[PDB]
Symmetry: C2
Subunit: 313 residues, 2 copies
């Protein structure tokens, strides 16, 4: 019954602000499970992190055993079982995707080295910050074989939850009845949102519906148009869902989208990528669900291969 | 059907922290669907549409519906719970009388709207400052349609801060600490009291609790949001679900018939137990300690035009 150590990077940012109270209240590891939060951000953010820590204290969360704030990944990751990687170099005006990938490669190499050096052997990692799939690949490869490749993932669950919700609104049904949308491929505009296997209760969703891909791909930009700011609440909620389903299991009959290491996948997607697939999770482990498709994936595969080359990988 | 919950100030930072907690079940529990009705000023309507979109994108199974509006009557239509985070923005070197009058405008209109269209048994907590006096304005402006026992002001953030500070000073987990009391006004005259506090089964503090909000602003450059949202959830949750045996929590409540000789006609923070949506003041936990906070609440009542 020792507290489970959970690291959150980018912890002075808006996703981190929305995420840490969910972890502390028990949404991640369960309502009985004590947690320790290890919060990482850049050195100029130390005072802001102290502010986050002070607010966490002021919540009087019964499960939150300890909070540590740091700018050193070797401190943040020390003994951690779960690492939620929100920190990343943000896209500035004038950057192409390649520029963003190159700014992020240094971050994720340092973090992957640190995780391999000091985290628990079985540490499970999810990358939220963009470009998420490639950042996760960089992280994994920087561990030089010391990190289980099945334990490094990238988050497509915000896109998945966006698609569940959209399908529910289009069908006029409660979102609680909708399952088994699939986001394939990259967490980018080449993602393939797929409703062909989706159901409402057990009814194929098509049979219940009397722009979908564009709306899902464009939703982040829509949030920015409305709010002036990127999604934070919903991203934090998705990161909790990604991890919670991974650790606790997906319920019977449900699969969820996860960016996972592609070696040995049942779809013939190239090896050596972090690629979003439909997954069940049982006993802390993902399994890709087969039979749900292939030419549909060519563009997102090609983009992931291009990014991997750009990563010097 | 879904319990209808209004949140005012819904385009602000407390609102942003609060609405996903409500939507995920933290307010009313794991089986109770909710409908959120989000109110802010008209210039904030686009921002509110962004909050609604993010709520949709969470795919919350308990969130049956979201409405966003700048019209209080639309926000409060049929609502059973109203969490009032919106208040007048406090200006640089503004007179306290002026601030109270400007808040009186807001809370009078909102109280009238609640009276007009909310459910008869609607429960209200005011978060936005000055919380106690704003709550009193709201109640008095409802001209009888609101049960006085159903209008409250939040001191739970101060209470949670005191629990945490006591646990830190004693070097124990905060889960072991209970029964701090915040008496009086949600202001610098609050009386943080540890005389009745328990650690387990076993029986600078004041300045630190009173100064905590300013400390957060120094560190973050912004007022508390996460912690205030969490406290709002705790205040309503404990009110509706009930407080566990042996636990009391601080709540600003209407002061008629209190057992402490505090004057009537105020919203005043007391130690309370709750059962099934009703608070009861816990007696015997003190009186001259309260004189200054009493006097400040009476002054604010008069300055508000009440």
């Amino acid at each position: 019954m020792s507290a489970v150590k959970v690291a959150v990077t980018g912890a002075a940012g808006q996703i981190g602000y929305a995420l840490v109270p969910l972890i502390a209240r028990g949404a991640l590891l369960g309502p009985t499970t004590p947690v320790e939060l290890r919060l990482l951000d850049i050195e100029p953010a130390l005072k802001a992190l102290a502010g986050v820590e002070a607010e966490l204290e002021d919540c009087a969360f019964p499960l939150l055993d300890k909070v540590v704030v740091t700018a050193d990944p070797r401190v943040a990751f020390d003994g951690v079982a779960i690492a939620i990687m929100c920190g990343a170099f943000p896209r500035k005006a004038g950057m192409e995707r390649k520029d963003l990938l190159e700014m992020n490669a240094r971050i994720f190499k340092e973090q992957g080295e640190a995780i391999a050096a000091v985290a628990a052997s079985d540490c499970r990692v999810v990358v939220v910050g963009n470009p998420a799939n490639t950042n996760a690949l960089i992280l994994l490869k920087s561990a030089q074989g010391k990190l289980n490749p099945r334990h490094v993932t990238a988050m497509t669950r915000l896109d998945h939850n966006r698609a569940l919700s959209l399908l529910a609104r289009k069908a006029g049904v409660p979102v609680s009845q909708v399952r088994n949308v699939i986001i394939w491929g990259n967490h980018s505009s080449t993602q393939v949102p797929d409703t062909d296997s989706a159901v409402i209760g057990t009814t194929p969703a098509r049979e219940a519906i009397k722009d979908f891909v564009q709306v899902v791909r464009g939703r982040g930009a829509e949030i920015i148009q409305l709010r002036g700011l990127s999604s934070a609440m919903s991203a934090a909620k998705a990161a909790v869902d990604h991890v919670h389903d991974w650790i606790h299991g997906t319920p019977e009959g449900v699969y969820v989208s996860m960016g996972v290491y592609s070696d040995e996948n049942p779809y013939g997607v190239p090896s050596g990528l972090i690629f979003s697939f439909p997954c069940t999770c049982h006993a802390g482990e993902w399994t890709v669900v087969s039979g749900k498709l292939k030419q549909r994936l060519a563009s997102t595969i090609a983009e992931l291969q291009e990014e991997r080359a750009q990563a010097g990988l």
